[PDB]
Subunit: 387 residues, 4 copies
């Protein structure tokens, strides 16, 4: 029916299913998971792969013999299951040293440490076969206006990303970078708060081709933005390197609900866009099984992420393929949207009386867009209420 397979490219962070349930106001409700157990259980659910922060895989401050052993055991689990590691990242947010940032910490020694910690993990990510290296600058920002000169912080952020690009080029690595925006939490305001801000920043890097975005559903929704619209701009720019899928109920703390939860209609339009555009990267879930759940509930929530993607994929494809919907799209002039405004050129447009002097503004204004009929056909398809 809606059964996931490795072909569907579903991936999960170790820190997702492995979340112990500690929140601002509460203690852990679940024991820590061995990464080996997570890889095995996710493979059984039909996942394609898993992702990690450095410190998820190797406990912070492990010796060289400890690090080697943690990686060896994980690699054996991947080999035993056929699971992949398409993406990795660095934890630049948990340890108290990062309380004012990693790459943009006011303290220079912390900025240098953050870069060395990242570089060590890039080497490991390449060893495990990752194609994308995510950076979430969760500690980059401020609670107050004087704490952070944002122009200086952006200079430091550019310097850091430029050094990382120099490093990967020097080593001949194929890996590319993906910046993950978030507007706030845990800092009062975070730098590069949206997909737009991250895309703009990339254009100022020395080697912009090496960098894209890793947008997260709930993050754009924490700014009340339209996630499908932001994804469309990322695709338009050629910068959708990776994506984080989850749910969020509007403007509040980062909930990280399972995908499909939260804004259901936005999830529908997102899947419609990813499929229409031919996005070929991982369908990665960055979610937290609520702390109300036991281990059985963790795996049920993970399974639900994949199931909801596959239901929505079916419904979006049926919408686009329906002759009645195709007629409604023409009635709404989606065909005309895709035609050039002035392929004839500037001079021809200026000399066209039909575009101004002799344009019947009133007749054009009277023409309905027929968007409500189109949207109710979309609702009917999502809900399986066609006919």
């Amino acid at each position: 029916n809606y059964q996931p397979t490795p072909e569907d490219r579903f991936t999960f962070g170790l820190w997702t299913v492995g979340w112990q349930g500690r929140d601002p106001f509460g203690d852990a409700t679940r024991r820590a998971l061995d990464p080996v157990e997570s890889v095995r259980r996710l493979a059984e659910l039909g996942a394609h792969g898993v992702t990690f922060h450095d410190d998820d895989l190797i406990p912070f401050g492990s010796s060289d013999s400890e690090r080697e052993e943690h990686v060896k055991r994980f690699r054996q689990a991947l080999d035993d299951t056929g699971m992949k590691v398409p993406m990795a990242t660095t934890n630049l947010f948990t340890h108290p040293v990062f309380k004012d940032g990693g790459f943009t910490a006011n303290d220079r020694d912390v900025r240098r440490y953050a870069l060395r910690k990242t570089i060590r993990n890039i080497d490991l990510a390449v060893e495990l076969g990752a194609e994308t290296y995510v950076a979430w600058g969760g500690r980059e920002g401020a609670e107050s206006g004087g704490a952070k000169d944002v122009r200086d912080a952006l200079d430091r952020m550019k310097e850091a990303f430029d050094l990382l690009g120099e490093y990967v080029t020097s080593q001949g690595y194929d890996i590319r970078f993906a910046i993950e925006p978030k507007p706030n939490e845990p800092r009062g305001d975070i730098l590069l708060p949206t997909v737009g801000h991250a895309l703009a920043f990339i254009e100022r890097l020395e080697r912009p081709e090496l960098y894209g975005v890793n947008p997260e559903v709930g993050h754009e929704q924490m700014a009340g933005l339209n996630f499908p619209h932001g994804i469309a701009q990322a695709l338009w720019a050629g910068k959708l390197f990776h994506i984080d899928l989850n749910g969020q109920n509007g403007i509040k703390y980062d909930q990280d609900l399972r995908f499909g939860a939260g804004d259901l209609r936005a999830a529908f339009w997102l899947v419609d866009l990813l499929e229409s555009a031919g996005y070929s990267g991982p369908r990665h879930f960055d979610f937290k099984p609520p702390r109300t759940e036991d281990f059985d509930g963790v795996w049920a929530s993970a399974a639900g992420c994949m199931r909801n993607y596959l239901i929505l994929k079916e419904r979006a494809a049926a919408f686009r393929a329906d002759p009645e919907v195709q007629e409604a799209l023409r009635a709404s002039r989606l065909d005309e949207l895709a035609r050039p405004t002035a392929a004839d050129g500037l001079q021809a447009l200026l000399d066209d009386r039909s575009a101004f002097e002799e344009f019947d503004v009133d007749a054009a204004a009277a023409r309905g867009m027929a968007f409500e009929r189109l949207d109710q056909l979309a609702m009917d398809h999502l809900l399986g209420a066609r006919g």
Copy 2:
């Protein structure tokens, strides 16, 4: 005391003081103002200049003899007062023809009309001496996911802006363009919803040097974003061509309160940044005197915009000049933020044991940032409560 002068570069839209008070749920509470009266009253308050949409200055559908007369009378008022016109824009949002957009309307004939209407007004803006031409795509967007293919809409938006750049180049005009973001209202979601999205879009235009942003305080705040942070990114990019100043009380409808109202502390940090950065453009107010007000209240609200800017300018300068604040900034390592992370280069950083192998993470983590003391000195300066 806090008396404005033309030197301070304060400007106002005709549509601001001239707002009749019609809202979604109410009729006009004030008669229309003649633009000549607005120019005269604003000059008396110490303004530098005024801005206009085409249809604010010339009623929509005026004949050639009518248009000429409206412009002649306005030019005489400017000449009588010494007032300038630094910026103009096009109304692509009021007339029902624009119900689905101007530049990104699904209907091709409407897109062509929108461009011709804009070009006619660029000529007038140049005649009146404007240096910046704003575009607010208030109707560009959607209420529903199927109504608007956002990739196609961005193609049409780029085509429009590229044609406008070709036009100004062909005529030898000195004018430059400024895109004004807004996240929503009047469309459910608007394209290019934030400063970041607009900056990213500009990088894809044929002649990016001709285009910048016109960010508005209340617009970024309607997405819960930090306006000073967004302005810093615009400055970092070299794209702060113009700005709209006002107030907003968080995430709701676009209030357009007088500047200083709304988020007072954010207004303080904004003025601090504009002054520190040496922003040289107009200090333009895009505000609505509340519909509770009579004409005396309109002018009081306009005067308050300028007064609040000047109070905050004084307090921000006193903050930065205070020796105790300068000491606190060093205690918080703002000096170290401005120093390069690795001027020594990538190889040197990799070979530096002090940056990783021999870095004392615990001692670094124990060092307080001293941001609370710094922020309370900022509060004390804003409130005039020092000593």
Copy 3:
């Protein structure tokens, strides 16, 4: 299939389908509708009835002969169609006299006028057979802190509602009042901003039994609140006299989308609650067909409101009736939630060692709530993806 009938008790405001499309930033896109035409077209769609503000039915400032004729024509249309008028209200928000409020205007003469205008329309509402009289205090509030002493305003609000209760009692009318909350828009902040605030206020009235709430989906969502939770509190209090159904995409301007649009999952849980609780009042839609639409689109959007309610009613009933869902509800201890905490009484609870001294906190904490499995069964039912 999902065909509405008068039995389903669907009602619409004249101002909904009759909305001309004027928004803060745009002119009307549709001609005014005759109320007679609206009654006829809604009856053809399967509606039960219609509602009105005074000034929707009788243009403001009509003479006695004009008023009589407008009512006569409307009554004939109701008689011709079998349509009902279950609710009416007063427009205390459009006319510029109400710029600072009706019942809570600072000007005493305006407060008295607002009461007389309301009383005149109560008489008409009773003549047309209305059971509920709504009050939306859209102008009651402020943009600034000094403009409105809120304790004094609440005194005036109570005085107004008490006089209206005295009036209906004096005339022997059966009609009851319903207060409609909204947090903001068109005032910066509106008094009685949520269902909770309105319920609390009612408890201070002289005759609280005469007053309930008319909560609106989009209004509670403009404060980021859970609409189903608020409806549950209203039901718990015995105060759900009427309801307004529509859609809203999070925290922004009041969108008034068709019901089902906006937060789809919240619409599902709402219908589930109304049906489970046996709510017997009108299913009233307070929505705006987007201004993109022509008259055909207006009727399509109205039809979609009713269709979406009926789809969701089917899916919620199937969820509750499913044996697998009933098992999941027991697994999640919804049965135990409905049992008294201490029917044995305070003394027995104090003397129960099993409740404290001998309670195994660790074993209780280890028990998963199984909420994720339950919620995925709810998702599967909503989407028609069961098996």
Copy 4:
């Protein structure tokens, strides 16, 4: 200058200054404080007293000899300093047993445990001299619609509060209860989400006189509501038993900034209201020193809470006392707001032609409210920019 004294009634929670800095995404940045040290340091800053959750004072699962010793040491610190304990509360949110709630947990045994844990701490609160017992139901609510029947949960909430009222009456205690609303966090949606919802709920309790509200600045602001307006409604109801003071930058995670930070103008209008109304209870701060700070920064942030209250108290008093402001208040008809609408009675109002038949609507509408002038005088007073 702005030096606090015990007379000013400033209080702090042990969990405020004692916050170790653990957030959703980060480890502790500060060691735990001994409550004895906190009492001593706060007394030195000019505080009046301190408040506690049970588990802040006595580590969870302490023996009878341990509990006795922790209380003895704390009582000695209070005696050594002259500090008071005006309020206490129960931690019904940290321990994993409370993952689905205390009073409204689906599991009946957990509800009974929550009541016994609360009752034990009420006895201790009375021993330490507390006048108010706060309940924050942070775990009462849901992430999903099926998890929690809200009518049943409200039945259980009422049963719990009724038992607590029976208990305090049986023991002859003078203590009263204060319910603390919050809209969300840590649950997706929390029951009793606003001041209004809590006030409404209290009216359904068996002994409503024993219960009031403990509203928190940042909590109402997390729903985008006007905190001063909500406080005014609480005062109007006679239910402002206690208050939590802090700051919040709009609609996001609960920031708990020092008081004065966040929405500065709202803080001004709040202090103005508390002082005007003669609120006599504790001025309690529920704030978190940001985790960027060391122990010196903790005490600086605490001191800043009190300093900002005292600055704003001075500015609000100067505003109200200014003859020019008194004139502006009359110009804006605040005097008329405080006069009864119809002291003459319903019949007299109906028979008054001046209130309807002969009311000049146009002349009334033309009268400006003069609110902008009034608000700019308020701004000038707050900023110390008068003349």
